């Protein structure tokens, strides 16, 4: 039941520009215990399977740019792109890995102008 | 490159007939990584199916749970997705997906594979 919630459901941003995109759980994904949040950013391009950006909410995986960068923490999380790059217009979801079934959030569609 | 996951299915398939997939991995120790089971489509969205950790343990989404079957092969690096009572709402797109550490990357997220219960 863990329901995972984006916004927007999709923006229309222009190159160069901060963008802001937000990711919901319906409860804590929080390990009291190591006190890190599992939850997992991914980016996905047209007839490209998705590709994992951040996880753990800031940990930016390899190859991934120094432009995006996931925060927040507990149930309300955000992925910025700090400056916007054309390539950048593909679809974002997020994803809990704390408890089983690990849902994906419905996708913020971003179109770069 | 080198890692790479290549799920192989069906494609085309007549309901309440089964579902096998194959996620063949190269590069990693299926022991030192856990691979999930996740399927997406226009309609439905990204969906989570299941998942078999490296020592063993399999979880399975409590929807599809009973018509689920998910099995490895360490020594073949191989996983497997038996789905059962096939719907037309099964029709997806199929992967398998690796988590673990050791590599170039955390995760590896397969081609797809596309299933077209028909």
């Known amino acids: 039941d863990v329901v995972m919630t984006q916004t927007p459901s999709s923006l229309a941003m222009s190159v160069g520009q901060k963008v802001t995109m937000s990711c919901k759980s319906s409860?804590?994904?929080?390990?009291?215990?190591?006190?890190?949040?599992?939850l997992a950013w991914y980016q996905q391009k047209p007839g490209q399977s998705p590709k994992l950006l951040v996880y753990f909410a800031s940990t930016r995986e390899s190859g991934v740019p120094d432009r995006f960068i996931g925060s927040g923490s507990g149930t309300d999380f955000t992925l910025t792109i700090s400056s916007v790059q054309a390539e950048d217009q593909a679809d974002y979801f997020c994803?809990?890995?704390?408890?089983?079934?690990?849902?994906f959030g419905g996708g913020t569609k971003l179109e770069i102008k | 490159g080198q890692v790479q996951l290549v799920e192989s299915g069906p494609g085309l398939v007549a309901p309440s007939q089964s579902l096998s997939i194959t996620c063949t991995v190269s590069?990693?120790?299926?022991?030192?990584?856990?691979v999930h089971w996740v399927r997406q489509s226009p309609g439905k969205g990204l969906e989570w199916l299941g998942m078999?950790?490296?020592?063993?343990?399999?979880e399975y989404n409590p929807a599809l749970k009973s018509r689920l079957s998910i099995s490895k092969d360490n020594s073949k690096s191989q996983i497997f997705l038996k789905m059962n009572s096939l719907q037309t709402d099964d029709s997806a797109m199929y992967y398998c997906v690796s988590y673990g550490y050791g590599g170039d990357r955390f995760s590896y997220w397969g081609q797809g594979t596309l299933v077209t219960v028909s």
């Open positions: 078999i950790w490296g020592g063993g343990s399999i």
């Open positions: 994803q809990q890995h704390y408890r089983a079934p690990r849902t």
């Open positions: 409860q804590s994904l929080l390990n009291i215990s190591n006190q890190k949040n599992y």
């Open positions: 590069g990693i120790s299926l022991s030192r990584y856990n």
